[PDB]
């Protein structure tokens, strides 16, 4: 049963419907869907355009001489992102200071969602997000979008369920509780199929990466998307509830934690 | 003797290309600036971008009704005839806090440039911008885009030719000298066919209106676009050059200066 034809109300490149064939819960409305991060705290991001590293290409930035391409860290594009073996990977997309055209090949994340997703009711994990088409390894899925808040503010938010940390070693957080995009509905999987990548577009302030999800393997039609929320989340939450990802390899179920 | 010397000065950043032609002289397509399609800053502007305090509507349609709390556009994206073209009020477009669909009728400026424009070499005023199509009165043309700076920083800029004052009353300016869009090339006309309007979209920091040009009459294909730069400019620049607008009632010509 279709409870909403587009939770994004046209804010994304494509519609993101919500269905619930499992239970009585209506299409969630306790948040505001936004497609880009909102700044509701006090931080000053360095947006100084003269600070940007930029390329001088006048092709499609598909050559290895593209300076922006060369700045990528712990990852790189083949045709699709690959990651280095074993600190998160950094992508520097082209920006307003680059000489290239708006439609160069180094603007994947800033160009937005391309894959077909659906918000759906899962059996045991509330709302989740699934792929409606096959998605090859290394494909951009969606950004993790919300309010940029400080570490102090995140620690006192009443609900911690929608936080994503921007951590160097001084930390900032993206809180998708009140304002967020489709990513706020992605569950934890102990068997993850997407990974977060730190991306820079309009600014290159290393304290404030944008978080982009890329597939970590080929994903089949119908599969739930999920990332590894990590030990910080589970060390907190496992004292109240345990993982219901249902994987034969689950690391956070009551059974796995007892053993 | 006009051939395209650049097919798109905006490098595909706008919805339509903006070609550059020169049938007057030997000047090359301007390259002493960086074309950008949204405002930038160098030193920090403390824009208040906090979403929780935005005024916003509760429409769940396309904001074509009378009850949209966000007021000035008609069904076609044009300023309503009531709209005071002499003393423009502020426009608050829809934002991320609004309930409506992205594609609603109150996001005209955020949708960007729709009309065909051309950067061209003028006879007597350097580079200028002209319409390559008819533009009905009250149509959005383009935004004045550049580097946001304080009025105090503007007062010390070496070149003041590309400044635009952001009306609030501390005040700010856009400087399009180093970073700007097609608007940086629009000349002064004493018989202007476009007007600037302060607009708020994603934030409502009243210090930092964004400046949108709307046609003030029906404009014909080929007509040079221009707004009235105003007295702050001519009080300064009259002593360096006179107006070449060619208007019959030109208020800033060698002739008019002489009388005054
Ligand atoms: C960011 S929300 C994901 C969307 C959430 N399922 C919903 O319905 O709104 C994170 C919360 O979802 C639930 N959740 C996510 N992954 C889970 C898992 N593997 N096992 C149990 N609950 C999970 C927990 O309540 C967790 O705090
Ligand atoms: C914002 S720039 C407009 C683009 C400019 N024509 C160019 O070639 O780069 C403003 C400058 O253009 C020239 N200009 C603009 N309008 C003019 C006019 N009506 N008469 C004479 N010069 C004008 C003056 O040099 C003025 O400072
Ligand atoms: C209990 O979960 C969290 C607690 C904190 C967090 C991030 C999470 C995460 C929440 C879920 N999110 C979707 C991804 C995992 C990180 N950042 C934080 N600062 C805290 C520690 C108390 C608030
Ligand atoms: C000489 O022209 C200007 C001087 C100043 C200005 C705006 C203009 C304008 C320049 C041209 N622009 C495209 C439209 C008219 C305003 N804002 C300013 N603060 C000053 C006063 C000295 C710097
Ligand atoms: Zn490049
Ligand atoms: Zn680049
Ligand atoms: Zn590029
Ligand atoms: Zn699990
Ligand atoms: Zn409305
Ligand atoms: Zn609105
Ligand atoms: Zn609206
Ligand atoms: Zn004149």
Phi, psi of B69 (to 5 degrees): -70, -45
Compute, in angstroms, the gap from residue A208 CA to the centroid of ligand 11.
30
DSSP A124: S
Among candidates A229, A216, A150, which has minimal Cα distance to A186? A229
Strand bridging mode B91-92 / B194-200: parallel
Phi, psi of A43 (to 5 degrees): -65, 150
CA dist B182 and B170 (Å) reads 27
C-alpha pair distances (Å), B179 with each of A29, A211, B38, B145, B182: 41, 28, 10, 8, 11
Q: Which two tokens stand for residue B197?
A: 């309007």
Q: Which of B119, B161, B179 to mutate to test the pocket of ligand 2 (most atoms within 8 A of CB)?
A: B161
Q: Which two tokens stand for residue A50?
A: 């003269």
The residue in chain A having the minimum alpha-carbon distance to the alpha carbon of residue B46 is A44
* Longest pairwise C-alpha distance within chain A: 59
CA dist A232 and B107 (Å) reads 42
The answer, yes or no, to whether any atom of ligand 3 lies below 6 A from the CB of A177, is no
A241 alpha-carbon distance from chain centroid: 24
Number of residues written out for chain B? 260
Residues in contact with A130: Cβ distance below 8 Å, sequence separation at least 6, in sequence order: A117, A118, A120, A222, A223, A224, A225
**Under an 8 A CB cutoff, do B96 and A49 touch?**
no
Among candidates B183, B209, B179, B207, which has minimal Cα distance to B194? B183
Residues in contact with A183: Cβ distance below 8 Å, sequence separation at least 6, in sequence order: A129, A142, A143, A144, A145, A176, A213
Task: Please count the other Cβ atoms lying within 10 Å of the Cβ belonging to residue A16.
Answer: 24
Tokens 């290159």 sit on residue: A204
Distance between the two ends of chain B, CA-based, in angstroms?
38
DSSP B196: E
Among candidates B162, B138, B140, B166, which has minimal Cα distance to B151? B166
Q: Which two tokens stand for residue B152?
A: 């105090």
Please state the atom number of ligand 2 nearest to the C-alpha of residue B162: 1
The answer, yes or no, to whether any atom of ligand 4 lies below 6 A from the CB of B165, is yes
Tell me the DSSP string of A22-57: SSSPPPP-SSEE-SS-EE-S------BGGG------
Contact between residue B226 and residue B244 where contact means Cβ atoms under 8 Å apart: no
Contact between residue B250 and residue B176 where contact means Cβ atoms under 8 Å apart: no
Gaps in chain A (C to N over 2.5 angstroms) fall after 79, 86, 169
Please state the atom number of ligand 2 nearest to the C-alpha of residue B189: 19
Tell me the DSSP string of A203-233: ---TTS-EEEEEESS-B-TTPBPEE---HHH
C-alpha pair distances (Å), A113 with each of A124, A178, A210, A243: 27, 21, 15, 28
Among candidates B229, B39, B220, which has minimal Cα distance to B116? B220
The residue in chain A having the minimum alpha-carbon distance to the alpha carbon of residue B148 is A48
C-alpha pair distances (Å), A50 with each of A55, A102, B34: 13, 19, 11
Phi, psi of B227 (to 5 degrees): -115, 170
Strand bridging mode B140-144 / B210-215: antiparallel
DSSP reduced 3-state for B224: strand
CA dist B95 and B73 (Å) reads 15
Tokens 């476009």 sit on residue: B194
Classify residue A102 as exposed, middle or buried by CB count within 10 Å of its CB (0-12, 13-18, 19+): middle
Contact between residue A135 and residue A219 where contact means Cβ atoms under 8 Å apart: yes
Best residue of A32, A33, A208 to probe chain B, by most B CBs closer than 10 Å: A32
DSSP reduced 3-state for A82: strand
Q: Which residues surround ligand 9, an ion (CB under 5 A)?
A: B 57, 59, 63, 68, 100
Residues in contact with A46: Cβ distance below 8 Å, sequence separation at least 6, in sequence order: A203, A204, A205, B44
Residues in contact with A225: Cβ distance below 8 Å, sequence separation at least 6, in sequence order: A117, A128, A129, A130, A131, A141, A186, A193, A194, A213, A219
Flag whether residue A125 sits within 8 Å of chain B, measured between CB atoms: no
CA dihedral for A159, A32, A198, A96, sign (positive or negative): negative
Q: How far is B200 from chain A (nearest CA, A)?
A: 16
Q: Which two tokens stand for residue B228?
A: 């009235």
- Beta partners for residue B166, in sequence order: B172
**Resolution to 1 decimal place, in Å:** 1.8
> Which of B96, B103, B179 lies nearest to residue A49, judging by beta carbons?
B179
**Under an 8 A CB cutoff, do A96 and B51 touch?**
no
Q: Which residues line ligand 1 (CB under 6 A)?
A: A 125-128, 161-162, 184-185, 187-188, 237, 243-245
Q: Return the ligand number nearest the Cα of A160.
A: 3
Q: Which helix or strand (DSSP H or E) is residue A237 part of?
A: helix A231-237
- Beta partners for residue A33, in sequence order: A180
Q: Looking at ligand 1, which residue's alpha carbon is closest to its atom 4?
A: A185
Phi, psi of A206 (to 5 degrees): -65, -15
Strand bridging mode A147-150 / A171-175: antiparallel
Q: Which two tokens stand for residue B200?
A: 């708020």
Contacting B residues, span 48-107, partner chain A, CB-CB under 8 Å: 49-52, 96-97, 99-103
Residues in contact with A102: Cβ distance below 8 Å, sequence separation at least 6, in sequence order: B11, B12, B13
- Beta partners for residue A147, in sequence order: A38, A175
* Longest pairwise C-alpha distance within chain B: 59
CA dist B83 and B197 (Å) reads 11
Contacting A residues, span 10-49, partner chain B, CB-CB under 8 Å: 10-11, 32, 34-36, 38-40, 44, 46-49
């Amino acid at each position: 049963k279709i409870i909403c034809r587009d939770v994004a109300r046209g804010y994304e490149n494509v519609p993101i419907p919500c269905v619930n064939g499992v239970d009585g819960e209506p299409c969630p409305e306790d948040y505001k869907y936004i497609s880009e991060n909102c700044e509701t705290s006090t931080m000053n991001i360095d947006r100084n355009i003269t600070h940007l590293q930029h390329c001088t290409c006048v092709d499609d930035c598909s050559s290895s001489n593209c300076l922006c391409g060369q700045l990528s860290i712990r990852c790189w594009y083949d045709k699709r992102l690959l990651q280095e073996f074993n600190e998160p990977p950094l992508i520097f997309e082209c920006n307003q200071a680059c000489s290239c055209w708006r439609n160069c090949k180094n603007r994947v994340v800033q160009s937005g969602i391309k894959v077909r997703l659906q918000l759906y009711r899962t059996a045991k994990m509330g709302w989740g997000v699934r792929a409606l088409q096959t998605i090859p390894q290394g494909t951009f899925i969606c950004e993790y979008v919300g309010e940029l808040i400080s570490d102090a503010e995140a620690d006192v938010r009443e609900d911690d369920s929608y936080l994503f940390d921007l951590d160097n070693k001084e930390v900032y957080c993206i809180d998708a509780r009140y304002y967020g995009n489709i990513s706020r509905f992605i569950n934890h999987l102990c068997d993850p199929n997407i990974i977060p990548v730190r991306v820079f577009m309009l600014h290159q302030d290393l304290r404030f990466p944008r978080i982009a999800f890329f597939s970590s393997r080929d994903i089949r039609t119908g599969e739930e998307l999920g990332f590894d929320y990590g030990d910080r989340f589970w060390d907190i939450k496992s004292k109240y509830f345990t993982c219901q990802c249902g994987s034969e390899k689950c690391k956070h179920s009551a059974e796995a934690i007892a053993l």
